[PDB]
Amino acid sequence: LPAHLRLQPIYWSRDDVAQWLKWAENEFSLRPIDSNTFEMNGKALLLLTKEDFRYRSPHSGDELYELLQHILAQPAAGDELKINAACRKVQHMVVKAALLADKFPVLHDIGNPKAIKCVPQADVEWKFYDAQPCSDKAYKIEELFYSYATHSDKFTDGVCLFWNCNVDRYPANSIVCRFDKSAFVNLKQLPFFYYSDSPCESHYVPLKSATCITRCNLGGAVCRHHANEYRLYLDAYNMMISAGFSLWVYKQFDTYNLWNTF
């Protein structure tokens, strides 16, 4: 019911687990137990045995254990609008960072039928392609079905963007989001990072993370604003990974290029 509990349990935080205990107490009329009965995150919860659940909660552990197994068997369907917004947030983050890091002069947006830039304030020439452009944006979209066998010698300037545009094989100069390996041989998996160049502001649980690429993290003292934004971005990113999307990137992508922007 709480949005985080619609993620796969491996994504649950320690607070998410506690909210799970409360949701389950109401849903199954269980004896209330201390919010600290399972002080761990979901990754840890999944390593417990059923005996551990029974020892930890004599009155309800077996039920909680079986509930978790039911959740792992029938994963919660996500909300389509929330997942769309999440994926869009990630798209903007990732493409903004790529352009800042490598200063591509042209972006080839392949599989974009609406001619909408995810990063409209970047200094880059944006070009759109789609096999079936929306008829109200086709005037500025190249009608093109991409196949590596036909186009691998094209679009070699700048960077290519394939945001959920499933082609036979991506070219090496690509940013890719794919929903569920030979399509990806020219690329590498893209690890999580958060980048921001917005002003730092101090007015939380201090954020410690090597993947918060902000000016205030150069010295390890993340400001409250970026702590907040990092955590919101991580929630959006978890919701897109938990739904089956994965990110891939051109092999030269380097987060130190982002640090150097400061």
Ligand SMILES: C[S@@+](CC[C@H](N)C(=O)[O-])C[C@H]1O[C@@H](n2cnc3c(N)ncnc32)[C@H](O)[C@@H]1O
């Ligand atoms: C999930 S939709 C929209 C993807 C878009 N990049 C986005 O972020 O919303 C997939 C799009 O890719 C187009 N498409 C699928 N295969 C394609 C291909 N091989 N070459 C060009 N466009 C393709 C479809 O016509 C459609 O507009």
Ligand SMILES: [Zn+2]
């Ligand atoms: Zn900051």
